[PDB]
């Protein structure tokens, strides 16, 4: 196959067109002088996740295409946001489907899904991404940060916002190069040479809690606990498992580019074998998912869709397995925010995992007609594309002339719609991406805010650590170095009449509530901004229709593209650039 | 004037009034669906034929007893939406069919500040002629002249004279 | 075919000595370890750039070379400055000379110089870029930016200075992160989940025009556009490009070592291609180098020259070419200020492309024989060397090297020794002549600290003032028609033209009040480089001549040694390119 080189990066709480106009843009526009580059494409998300794909000419080294993407890369590191340098930006030459999903589970259920994540992330994972082979390593779930959850009201009655705390976080939860006692070049006679130590990371929650945020005029202290609930939790909130409907980490692991599947899945099974002995009572390894006696099924809500509705469709289709398939599925291993084409709260997908072979006789009980038979039974179901899986066309509609975001999609549903009408060459002619959604959008009075005497970095600091979160800096847990985070407590950021509950102090020390500064209203945007070589572009599938051959279809879809408005180009990829 | 949610034939009308499908809309109405079918935010069909310009659609909506003034959970109306995005026809129409020409979002924002802002200015001259108060101030104070002057755009500050 | 990876870096309103000493010192003394290095050149130039040569032995894998070179890059980018950074260092691995242009014009006449090499770089250039084989691309012209053009009369009529402005625009022109409604982890039941959108990228010269800079004690306010005026308009204004005289931009391609020709050139007229069809109404490219057909005019006049002389000299090559051979050549690229020499104020270059070959019969009428006469009419030109060649093994490249910190003005006297005595041996030496270029008049301005403490003025305040205003600053991006693009704050002309206008840019100190340049420095004329170069990590001074008619290299090499040998203690030598 053609080999493909994957950048990653985040930006907490940036929705995607911050993603795409900061970050996504910019690598872009320097990811030139490269060797063997067919094409370029990209997805800026309103997770704050960027992953741009650059696929190469067939026969081309992946090893030397990966370095020439890293170099380039990092010569625009700089022109990045510190946000998102300080994530780490991976790069990846890896297959798009997974080699192998190790579980892990607790059988005394000592330990909660989240428990249990940190367990991986922190115990596991490093040394299975260091493995040989190993591509890529997808944590199914997250790694435990310190959070810091902020209550609005508390930080209000002691004149204190976000921007305090993590000044003070910064502060006290610092890690100091403090020299020697007697060090270099030291005067004639010295006889002691000791090190000095002054502040070290923290290492627990009673340790950040009483940071100390300021002493009243009164004399009285005001500590961190005072104004913030303070708990291990993960970096994000995104990603939930289980297996066999009980609670469950993992790590979805991809193969390299090249590498042997074989030997790679022996290597982790021996990694493996090393991290058992020590791993707390109750923990066991489950193996849901090897590469045929596995299938996967997909789940794909509408965006907007919350982690609530597409678990409950995750359940029926774990339920189908667990009853209606029972003498056939060994195992379903479930994950919720994590599906086929990336990440949100509104995808999912399942790894299935079939009895021996030998006990599934017959042809009715076979992959095929059990994937067959499940796709079948899932696509009843209610504002989902639900399908059970082991022929088409793959377009670009690309934006030439500075069109923007809302006429391309208005170019995209003429398309559409006249591909329709053609039903005879066209079928199943759909977008692969997302569609508009309702967003928030709140305006700052640059002068009602100068008037008062607040500043706009407050604001805008306050705003975005307490609704979307902010990585501070790191502390060490139980010996391994992590995250640090502020955030609202969920009470506090669910609702628009919230926003008027956090203050910010101005110049003169009066505390300020939002409302006096700022107006909102809802606006649609995406969640999901697309492009192709460069340019903004919505990525379009379809097959053609029975007894009609692939060429066919593809010459209508040109036809009918020429007759798109002006400035409107479009491209073949994937399955249909040769 | 602040709609809740309706279900299966109330989402299936809201999301066709987004599409502008037209022929659906016309089904779903005469099948019983509820004209007022709010979203999560508070969006009924008739704001959602506004924001995305489908004329046909508020036409119709209008026809079967949709409210004109219907509020979003913000205070936003049909008409706020259709005279921010310049949509000339709709602005006509929903004054035509009662549609309140000062109506104040949660922020006192009103209908003539936002074409004021987005220079829709055709659109800022049938408010005015409809009754819109042209001395109406939004929580900072502003009214559309004074917009008009942050804009600097002079074409505007003629019209409002 | 020796590979040469070059590294290039950019440094907004620099002198030669300051982009030296802060980025091409620094980058050098990483540059060891390095298989198959022969050498390294580097020139710190008066425009804010530097230029690093490394050139390889023969075979070297070019690939592999790169990746070195890069991986001790990466040693030095920390220590860079950060607005050398920003502009982004580029490491790659061309030919010296370009493979072909591509030229752009408006046949409508619609479009200005401005807007068509805008147009080139945001639409055209990237793609063009990433194509494989393309291994460096210059443009001939500059991307549009947001100019902030400032007066000091308005800034200083309302107390403000360039640093509040740079302030008001990082805050007033942002692109800010401000989460969700009803983002994980959730109160269990939530139905509602939004995006918070706040602040984006400004995309318009009227968005500009209304940031609030500051709201007066009587209530009303001072906007950007009452400081200055706002406009679209180039990163800078050093590339301007004709084609037959008519407005033009473009793109100089030069091919990736080890690359092939054919190939590549197929595949940039098969991404041209795809562009075309979404061209603005006029727009046209056209093809005025393809690479016998075609040769170059180069344009060198002496430092301190302007634009405007700079421009009459290639008037006058143009003119040559459309009047006197017409009948042989169809076109002529004329672009001022890029040239053979890299890049600056005193140079141009003119690419020029002939008729069919069978429309021009005789030999007085192919390559040779009309860049001979070109090269013959030229040479009448004074205060410039034109000359006109095709694209030898009878000249020498030499180095004259300071080994011992004697500084850049006695490598100069040392260098006027061997140049004259070169100059008395006419028999074996002929035209023995720096490459480089000579020192120029240059304001000197030394700030008073003492002063500047007891006013309560801080150094960055001022420093940031002074280089903002006659240098110009990257601020920020904004997004131009969906493409990212940068914001730039500078003087407008009219305030940063003459000594004099240094005395109307006011400062504010601690206590409010406003303190004009005049009270905090003094200024003098004195001389500097607005080119020095260096020779593996030393100053240095190339200087080219040719062997007397007759006698082979290796004996003019012998000459110039012994020349050398009587230099000044701390003066050695080198021999590069041909020589070596």
Redesign the interface.
Same mark, same amino acid.
């Given at each position: 196959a053609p080999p493909a080189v994957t950048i990653s990066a985040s930006? !907490?709480?940036?929705?995607?067109?911050?993603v795409q106009?900061?970050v996504t $843009?910019?690598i872009?526009?320097?990811?030139?002088?490269?060797?063997?580059?067919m094409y370029?494409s990209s997805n800026s998300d309103?997770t704050?996740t960027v992953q741009i794909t650059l696929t190469f000419?067939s026969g081309t080294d992946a090893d030397?295409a990966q370095? $020439?993407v890293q170099?380039k890369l $990092?010569?625009?590191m700089?022109?990045l946001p510190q946000?998102v340098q300080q994530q780490g930006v991976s790069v990846e030459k890896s297959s798009s489907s997974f080699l192998m999903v190790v579980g892990v589970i607790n059988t005394d259920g000592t330990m909660t899904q989240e428990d249990i994540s940190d367990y991986v992330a922190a115990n596991m994972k490093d040394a299975i991404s260091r493995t040989s082979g190993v591509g890529d390593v997808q944590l199914f779930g997250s790694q435990y940060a310190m959070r810091i959850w902020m209550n609005p009201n508390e930080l209000n009655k002691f004149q204190l916002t976000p921007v305090d705390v993590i000044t003070a976080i910064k502060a006290q939860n610092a890690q100091v190069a403090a020299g020697q006692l007697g060090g270099t070049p030291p005067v004639k006679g010295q006889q002691l040479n000791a090190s000095i130590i002054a502040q070290t990371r923290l290492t627990s929650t009673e340790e950040f809690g009483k940071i100390l945020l300021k002493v009243n005029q009164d004399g009285s202290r005001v500590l961190l606990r005072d104004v913030a609930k303070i708990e291990l939790?993960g970096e994000?909130?995104?990603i939930i498992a289980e297996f066999n409907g009980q609670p469950a980490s993992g790590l979805g692991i991809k193969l390299a580019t090249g590498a042997n599947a074989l030997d790679t899945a022996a290597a982790i099974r021996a990694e493996l074998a090393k991290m058992e002995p020590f791993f707390p009572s109750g923990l066991k390894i489950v193996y849901p998912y090897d590469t045929q006696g596995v299938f996967m099924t997909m789940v794909q809500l509408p965006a907007?869709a919350?982690?609530?509705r597409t678990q409950k469709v995750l359940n029926e289709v774990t339920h189908y397995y667990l009853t209606k398939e029972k003498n056939n599925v060994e195992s379903v291993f479930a994950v919720n925010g994590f599906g086929f084409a990336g990440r949100g $709260?509104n995808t999912g997908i399942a790894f299935v995992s079939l009895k021996d072979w030998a006990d599934r006789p017959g042809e009715e009980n076979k992959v095929e007609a059990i994937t067959m038979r499940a796709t079948r039974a899932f696509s009843q179901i209610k504002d989902a594309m639900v399908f059970a899986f082991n022929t088409g066309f793959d377009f670009e509609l690309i934006?030439?002339?500075?069109?923007?975001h809302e006429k391309l999609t208005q170019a995209r549903?003429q398309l559409l719609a006249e591909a329709a009408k053609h039903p005879d060459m066209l079928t199943s002619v759909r977008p692969n991406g997302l569609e508009d959604?309702?967003?928030?959008?709140?305006?700052?009075?640059?002068?009602?805010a100068?008037?008062l005497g607040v500043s706009?970095?407050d604001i805008?600091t306050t705003?975005?650590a307490?609704?979307?979160?902010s990585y501070v800096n790191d502390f060490i847990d139980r010996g391994r170095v992590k995250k640090v985070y502020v955030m609202s407590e969920?009470?506090y950021?669910?609702? !628009?009449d919230?926003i008027g509950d956090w203050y910010v102090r101005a110049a003169d020390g009066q505390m300020v509530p939002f409302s006096a500064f700022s107006?909102?209203?809802?606006?649609?945007?995406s !969640?999901r901004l697309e492009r192709y070589?460069?340019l !903004?572009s919505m990525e379009i599938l379809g097959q053609a229709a029975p007894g009609k051959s692939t060429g066919e279809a593809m010459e209508l879809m040109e036809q009918l593209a020429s007759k798109l408005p002006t400035?409107v180009?479009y491209?073949w990829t994937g399955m249909s650039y040769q | 004037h602040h709609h809740h949610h309706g279900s299966d034939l109330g989402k299936k009308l809201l999301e066709a009034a987004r599409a502008g499908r037209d022929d659906e809309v016309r089904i779903l109405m005469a099948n019983g669906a509820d004209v007022n079918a709010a979203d999560v935010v508070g969006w009924t069909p008739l704001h959602l034929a506004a924001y995305w310009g489908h004329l046909e659609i508020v036409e119709v909506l209008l026809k079967n007893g949709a409210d004109v003034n219907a509020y979003d959970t913000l205070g936003s109306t049909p008409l706020h939406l259709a005279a921010h995005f310049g949509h000339l026809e709709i602005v006509e129409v929903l004054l035509k069919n009662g549609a309140d020409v000062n109506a104040k979002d949660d922020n006192g924002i009103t209908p003539l500040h936002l074409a004021a802002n987005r220079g829709h200015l055709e659109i800022v001259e049938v408010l005015l002629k409809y009754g819109a108060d042209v001395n109406a101030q939004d929580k900072f104070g502003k009214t559309a002249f004074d917009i008009s002057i942050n804009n600097g755009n002079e074409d505007l500050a003629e019209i409002l004279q």
């Open positions: 930006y !907490p709480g940036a929705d995607a067109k911050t106009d900061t $843009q910019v872009e526009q320097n990811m030139n002088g490269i060797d063997n580059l370029m309103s704050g000419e030397i370095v $020439q170099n $990092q010569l625009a700089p022109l946000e939790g994000n909130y995104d907007g919350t982690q609530e $709260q934006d030439q002339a500075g069109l923007g549903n959604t309702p967003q928030f959008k709140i305006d700052i009075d640059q002068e009602k100068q008037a706009i970095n805008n705003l975005g307490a609704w979307g979160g969920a009470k950021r669910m609702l !628009p919230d107006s909102s209203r809802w606006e649609y945007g !969640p070589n460069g !903004p400035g180009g491209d | -």
